[PDB]
Structure 1
Amino acid sequence: NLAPLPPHVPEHLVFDFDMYNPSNLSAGVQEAWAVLQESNVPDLVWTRCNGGHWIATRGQLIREAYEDYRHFSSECPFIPREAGEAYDFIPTSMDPPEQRQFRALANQVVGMPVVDKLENRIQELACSLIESLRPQGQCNFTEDYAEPFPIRIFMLLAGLPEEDIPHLKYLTDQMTRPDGSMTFAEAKEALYDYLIPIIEQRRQKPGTDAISIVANGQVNGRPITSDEAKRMCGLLLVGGLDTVVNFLSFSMEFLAKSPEHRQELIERPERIPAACEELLRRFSLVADGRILTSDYEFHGVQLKKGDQILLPQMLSGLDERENACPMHVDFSRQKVSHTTFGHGSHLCLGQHLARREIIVTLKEWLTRIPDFSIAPGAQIQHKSGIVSGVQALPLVWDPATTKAV
């Protein structure tokens, strides 16, 4: 459905892009979003899809808007409006100044010191999952690795049972790529229905897990409230269950389709960290946004108080104004410009965990299964939303070509 054009929006800026079902999706989701960067498309457009909203299409505008929290507020960060209004996770739904105190607590549970110490378990899980698959000569990569590897690490960190994954993953996905059976509000309340009692249990009897540390945490020296803890823990669950999970499939699809890039990383494994960054740019996957706090003229366009603006993190690094030959993957690229982990005061707190999971996956997969391909006759289908992903990724290889370590 196309929402009626608001009085202040001129026809020449209308580009009816649907972030949940973009028309060019068959080409690949990044390609589908990149239609917004054709030379005839303005820097800032209005779509009548999903209730009506602006979209900034270029890295320069995306970065600027993410820096200017006084005009572009995080209070309502998701489209559609109903989703952004219901969205209340911490720290994301807060602007500075109040936002900042909550970042330190989140860093205690997912930041570099936690990741540094989790490294052995991350390494051991990647190796055991991949070794289990290796002799099979095939896998359904999304379900056999992309999901269980990051999700089991997160559930371990959070002290949550692995048998709870299907329910929590389903709810998470309704917040980013809704199937239509739940509104954002309904998915959020179901997630809170799960979390609220666990938070109370761990405030009564603290453990060492992430939920315990959040639930018993302090924020700038005063106790976190149960409500705040719930709102933080909800966000961490979403980061754990619906970010790296998707990104790994884009990366592995790419490697399946490009033998020369596999061979590069096999022959020069020291390039894997750089490769991770270049893949983060090329297969960037997040797009949320902000709400206008006031009427504001931005790059020659009149924005109105309360208008939503999508500021796709995915697009900055695909912008040819930020990186030449942007759809080309070059592991030797010298200035890899992107906003894949966000920009401004909300810069991703999970990015060190994410990079470790990616780098460990690349190293340990290519050691054991150096040569693999997309399954015969398979067409890989992407899906689009707040976080984009890969619906299924069937891979094959000759288990004669694999090595047990």
Structure 2
Amino acid sequence: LLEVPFSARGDRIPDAVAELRTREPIRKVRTITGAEAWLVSSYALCTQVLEDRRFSMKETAAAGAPRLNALTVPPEVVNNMGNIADAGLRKAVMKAITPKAPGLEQFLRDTANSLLDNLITEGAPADLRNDFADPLATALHCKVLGIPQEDGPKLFRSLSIAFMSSADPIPAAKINWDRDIEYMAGILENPNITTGLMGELSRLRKDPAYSHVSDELFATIGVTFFGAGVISTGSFLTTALISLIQRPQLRNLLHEKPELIPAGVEELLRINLSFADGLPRLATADIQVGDVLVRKGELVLVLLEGANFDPEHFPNPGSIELDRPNPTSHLAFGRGQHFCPGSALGRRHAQIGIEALLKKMPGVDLAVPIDQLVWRTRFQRRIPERLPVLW
């Protein structure tokens, strides 16, 4: 039986996705746990699944369900956004993580420019993942959360394990989870934390209108938004920079006309292979999806690059076109109930990171042949361990 995932490489889509989309856009596969699942790979069917709440994210955590991979968080946390909504906290969380907070965009620029200055001073080769994209992501999310910049690196080092995609439970994941929860609980008791997401959560925690919300949920919001945000933005920016380096004509165009960078980033989002696995959902009813009657209790995997390279929806899908008529209709941030709450911040992180890099390193290029990149395996993202460049 066809095993997923197909390839950990984030620099090229396997030829098999297109043939699967054409012939079997919903197809039975085996996951790394040994469970069976339905892999959905066309734009039409991917959108159907994500927009039908009966395909439940929450129920993927039920005991005895077929699993894509092992949980790395407590089962209740799989429903974290539903818990946030039920607590009446959605508006406050969204307001705290907008890229339009005063001084945040300028903080992003100053930080990106400082990171790039340090690389230039040290001399090529430079590692654009470990010494640019991930530190930029980490610094951004410390500022967004309102926590000390010096705490970022230790929090960041949990993520190589927290976002593993493993057949079995991971002992280190619980060690790091409990420790990072204790950190965020301490932050909520820290009177000097008055800004960002944790500053706001700290205030709502003492507000009688939120008296019933548990201290547990408040800390969980901090841990999960730091982790999801840092791993997602660092990983997306890293693999977007590869796609840009691989396209010197686009690199030069965006350097010459940086007003096109937002449109470029939107296409880089569309063609991005950062998510290593399909998005998992558990059917809570018998539901027809294409030629398959998905049965209650079965696992469905929504393959984002299946949708995003679907030639029916995105003609010439492998080509970056800055003037498509449906440019944000990609699924890089998902779709439906669980659409990424950090999408605006993720866009701005990448836009500013690319703007700064192209200004400082207009001649940026890989310093090793592309096949020498080492792609992380059994992880929820596809990323190179190091991204060596010259300029």
Q: TM-score, normalised by structure 1?
A: 0.82
Which of 143, 158, 164 is equivalent to 1:156? 143
Equivalent residues of 1:288, 1:313 under 8 A apart? yes
**Deviation digits for residues 85-132 of structure 1, max 9, x if unmatched?**
844437656399x56944323213212443x54112111111111122
> Match for 2:316: what amino acid?
C
* 1:310 is the counterpart of 2:301: yes
Deviation at 1:342, TM superposition (A): 1.2
Q: Which residue of 2 aligns with 1:76?
A: 60
- Aligned to 2:351, the other structure's residue is in SS state helix
Equivalent residues of 1:29, 1:388 under 8 A apart? no
**Deviation digits for residues 290-332 of structure 1, max 9, x if unmatched?**
1111333332313232222111334321111220111112223
Equivalent residues of 2:26, 2:291 under 8 A apart? no
Q: Which residue of 2 aligns with 1:141?
A: 128
**Gapped regions of structure 2 (runs ≥ 5):** none
> Match for 1:303: what amino acid?
V
In the alignment of these two chains, the number of paired residues is 375
Q: Which residue of 1 aligns with 2:24?
A: 42
* 1:394 is the counterpart of 2:388: yes
**Distance (Å, rounded) in 2 between the aligned partners of 1:364 and 1:280:** 18
> Match for 2:288: what amino acid?
E
Q: Which moved more, 1:118-127 or 1:214-223?
A: 214-223
Q: What RMSD in Å do the two structures reach over aligned CA positions?
A: 3.1
Change (3 A) 1:168 1:220: same
**Deviation digits for residues 322-346 of structure 1, max 9, x if unmatched?**
2011111222333223011110022
**Distance (Å, rounded) in 2 between the aligned partners of 1:59 and 1:184:** 33
* 1:380 is the counterpart of 2:373: yes
Q: Which residue of 2 aligns with 1:5?
A: none
Equivalent residues of 2:284, 2:296 under 8 A apart? yes
State how 1:180-219 maps to structure 2 within 5 Å: 183=169, 187-188=173-174, 190-196=176-182, 198-203=184-189, 205=191, 207-217=194-204
**Distance (Å, rounded) in 2 between the aligned partners of 1:85 and 1:161:** 24
Deviation at 1:279, TM superposition (A): 0.6
Equivalent residues of 1:58, 1:315 under 8 A apart? yes
Q: Which residue of 1 aligns with 2:252?
A: 263
State how 1:24-63 maps to structure 2 within 5 Å: 24-25=7-8, 28=10, 31-32=13-14, 35-38=16-19, 41-50=23-32, 51-52=34-35, 53-63=37-47
Q: Which moved more, 1:304-313 or 1:348-357?
A: 304-313
Q: Which moved more, 1:83-92 or 1:118-127?
A: 83-92
**Gapped regions of structure 1 (runs ≥ 5):** 1-13, 398-405
**Distance (Å, rounded) in 1 between the aligned partners of 2:368 and 2:189:** 52
**Distance (Å, rounded) in 2 between the aligned partners of 1:138 and 1:220:** 55
**Distance (Å, rounded) in 2 between the aligned partners of 1:264 and 1:166:** 34
Deviation at 1:221, TM superposition (A): 4.5
**Distance (Å, rounded) in 1 between the aligned partners of 2:157 and 2:166:** 10
* 1:324 is the counterpart of 2:310: no
* 1:249 is the counterpart of 2:253: no
Q: Which residue of 2 aligns with 1:354?
A: 346
Change (3 A) 1:243 1:81: closer
Deviation at 1:253, TM superposition (A): 1.3
> Match for 1:128: what amino acid?
S
Change (3 A) 1:276 1:48: same
Equivalent residues of 2:129, 2:238 under 8 A apart? yes
Seq. identity, %: 20
* 1:343 is the counterpart of 2:342: no
Equivalent residues of 1:55, 1:311 under 8 A apart? yes
**Deviation digits for residues 257-312 of structure 1, max 9, x if unmatched?**
22211111122221111001011111142342211113333323132322221113
**Distance (Å, rounded) in 2 between the aligned partners of 1:261 and 1:81:** 37
**Distance (Å, rounded) in 1 between the aligned partners of 2:324 and 2:229:** 29
- Aligned to 1:382, the other structure's residue is in SS state coil
Q: TM-score, normalised by structure 2?
A: 0.84
**Distance (Å, rounded) in 1 between the aligned partners of 2:380 and 2:335:** 16
Change (3 A) 1:38 1:86: farther
- Aligned to 2:82, the other structure's residue is in SS state coil
